[PDB]
Structure 1
Amino acid sequence: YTRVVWCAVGPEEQKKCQQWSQQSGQNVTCATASTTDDCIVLVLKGEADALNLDGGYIYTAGKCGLVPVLAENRKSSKHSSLDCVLRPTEGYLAVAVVKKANEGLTWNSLKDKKSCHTAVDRTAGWNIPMGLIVNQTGSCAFDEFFSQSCAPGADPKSRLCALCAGDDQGLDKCVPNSKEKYYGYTGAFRCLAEDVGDVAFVKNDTVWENTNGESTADWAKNLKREDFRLLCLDGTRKPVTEAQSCHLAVAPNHAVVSRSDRAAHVEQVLLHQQALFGKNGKNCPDKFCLFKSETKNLLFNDNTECLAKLGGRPTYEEYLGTEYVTAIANLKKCSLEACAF
């Protein structure tokens, strides 16, 4: 009865969640929904307990009363061995990536080009770049900025979905889940790699994890970091090695959210689950690994070292940071006392 019901977004996450359920002796069970928003609703209804969310979604969930529980913490050597679970998160770098061969393309010549986004409402893939663009063009018509895009979650018949490809069969074009070929960090980077789009709004880690043999996936196998460039806000282009001096923003880390009344129980179960299936986990590589799914970033990002305890029991606004919260509210003024549900 102590059981935590995880919410999986789409069939692939559902399959991984089921594997996790089996290996956890049903200490974790699965609820599945087609989109992250639907999962948030299941949690609000009490039909699911938790799921790991990108900051843009933490904002949506938070307005609905859901809270931060634990955050993804990426192998980053700083904070010596203050162990992982106790190490404070540093956030990730949201970047704009283009092909080096696409010369002359800069942050200042993005209008009318083709873009690849992780998903509508996500932090590196949407909130940050579109916020910056609405800001600079002084206009809310962000649906008109890029000539075509793949922005999972947007209207499928719109130009924002024109570049999306759907699943092996063309079904689910533009759905905001892994069934869409170009969905998420890896999908948006793939959209760029395959030259479907001119620019990809992802995070620094994505570029590294899908180049120079780091991915053995067929579209990624042959990719070289030097064939890519980051777009700096000052109009310059730099090597992906320059991320720290050429990013759009620093993003909150993805984090597990739950209803406030279930947060303590979810935290407890998760800490026990990663002890078993996390990076150095007792049953990881071996029976199951919570943080692996072949660069597909299912349930959690594949580069997650551990889920870390938060500092000073954050409200969702403290967790996301005042800078980011303001940016989202300002951007959403184009589409304050919320919960869209």
Structure 2
Amino acid sequence: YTRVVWCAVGPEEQKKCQQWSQQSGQNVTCATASTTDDCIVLVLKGEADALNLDGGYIYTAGKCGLVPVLAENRKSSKHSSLDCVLRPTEGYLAVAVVKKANEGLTWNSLKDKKSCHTAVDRTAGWNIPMGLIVNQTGSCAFDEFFSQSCAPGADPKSRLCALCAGDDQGLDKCVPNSKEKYYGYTGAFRCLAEDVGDVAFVKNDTVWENTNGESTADWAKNLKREDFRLLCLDGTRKPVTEAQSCHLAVAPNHAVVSRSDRAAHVEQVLLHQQALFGKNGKNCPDKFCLFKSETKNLLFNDNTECLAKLGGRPTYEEYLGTEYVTAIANLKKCSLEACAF
């Protein structure tokens, strides 16, 4: 049944997809939508086959019967012989970052400050930090905790979208796709780097990849690691070198999902496609690389080493872990079980 339709979210992923489609001789084609939720609906309709999702969206996707297929895998020193494709995944660290110069700003003096989020419903940018905040404050009124935010996905007219910028021209303010200047892990850290916000909720890989000459992008050009700090839950402030001990939680890797009746087929074309355009593919650097997009994390995060088999053909709760499934459940009570479409 060898022909896979990828769902791209927004015009930039649409363009990267169209490119990949060409280089594959149409073994993969593209469908496009404005939001991740819409791409999820397309897959359900059967109009698209798969897409890579942050854990927060896997949860939405799972209640509707979509299943995790292969997971993103970057690389950790001690997990060495084992192949990337068979190596277990580690999950990433969700952290809260602040400007060093913002002396005296801790996890406990966050109320009324200005925040930068990857996008509503996402693990590091939303579910983990707001989960703790509802928790800590005993209030479901998370829309009144920060004076202002850029939380792609919220009501364009609420304070939660006040700090968002939209595209080149001011259009699409607060859309949960890359047209929004402060969308995703990158847009969010940018929102803080330009001091639009006091804190950004991203993952720890983001600070390292957009500081000390790693980014090339004009806004990240002069960023230095020592000018940032991580906020720990114990009210303390640490250098970004100490994330192992100052994170809010460890998140499950983004993963490709698809309808169960389509999973095997999706899995097979991907392992092949990967063999050709992944980290060491026949054709990567020279013609095309699935995992690169010059600091934008288009379709896939730019630090993905390979997509890996899951082992224990896990359901989505098994993939997310009970720990995280319950964090999302408790937070979702504020805004009991069904495909939400």
TM-score w.r.t. length of structure 2: 0.99
Query: 3-state SS of the aligned residue for 2:268?
Result: helix
Distance 1:311 1:186 in 2: 31
Distance 1:259 1:131 in 2: 29
Query: 3-state SS of the aligned residue for 1:258?
Result: strand
The alpha carbon displacement at 1:65 in A equals: 0.2
Query: 3-state SS of the aligned residue for 1:321?
Result: helix
Distance 1:310 1:14 in 2: 27
The alpha carbon displacement at 1:340 in A equals: 1.0
1:258-310 CA distance string (max 9 Å, x none): 00000000000000011000011110111100000011000000000000000
Q: Flag structure 2 segments of 5+ consecutive residues without an equivalent.
A: none
Distance 1:157 1:213 in 2: 36
Of the structure 1 ranges 283-292 and 77-86, higher mean CA displacement relative to structure 2 is found in: 77-86
Note the aligned Cα RMSD (angstroms): 0.6
Distance 1:311 1:135 in 2: 34
The alpha carbon displacement at 1:37 in A equals: 0.4
How many residue pairs match? The answer is 341
Corresponding position of 2:59: 59
The alpha carbon displacement at 1:80 in A equals: 1.1
Distance 1:116 1:217 in 2: 19
Distance 1:202 1:32 in 2: 26
Query: 3-state SS of the aligned residue for 1:163?
Result: coil
1:18-74 CA distance string (max 9 Å, x none): 000000110000000000000000000000000000000000000000000000001
1:160-189 CA distance string (max 9 Å, x none): 000000000000000000000000000000
1:101-131 CA distance string (max 9 Å, x none): 0011000000000000000000000000000
The alpha carbon displacement at 1:78 in A equals: 2.4
Corresponding position of 2:332: 332
Runs of 4+ in 1 over 3 A off after TM superposition: none
Query: 3-state SS of the aligned residue for 1:143?
Result: helix
TM-score w.r.t. length of structure 1: 0.99
1:193-236 CA distance string (max 9 Å, x none): 00000000000000000000000000001000000000000000
Distance 2:123 2:338 in 1: 18
The alpha carbon displacement at 1:338 in A equals: 1.7
Distance 1:42 1:297 in 2: 22
The alpha carbon displacement at 1:311 in A equals: 1.9
Query: 3-state SS of the aligned residue for 2:261?
Result: helix
The alpha carbon displacement at 1:315 in A equals: 0.2
Distance 1:255 1:212 in 2: 29
Over the matched positions of the two proteins, sequence identity in percent amounts to 100
Distance 1:183 1:119 in 2: 6
Distance 1:264 1:248 in 2: 35
Distance 1:39 1:286 in 2: 30
Distance 2:66 2:185 in 1: 24
Distance 1:340 1:200 in 2: 28
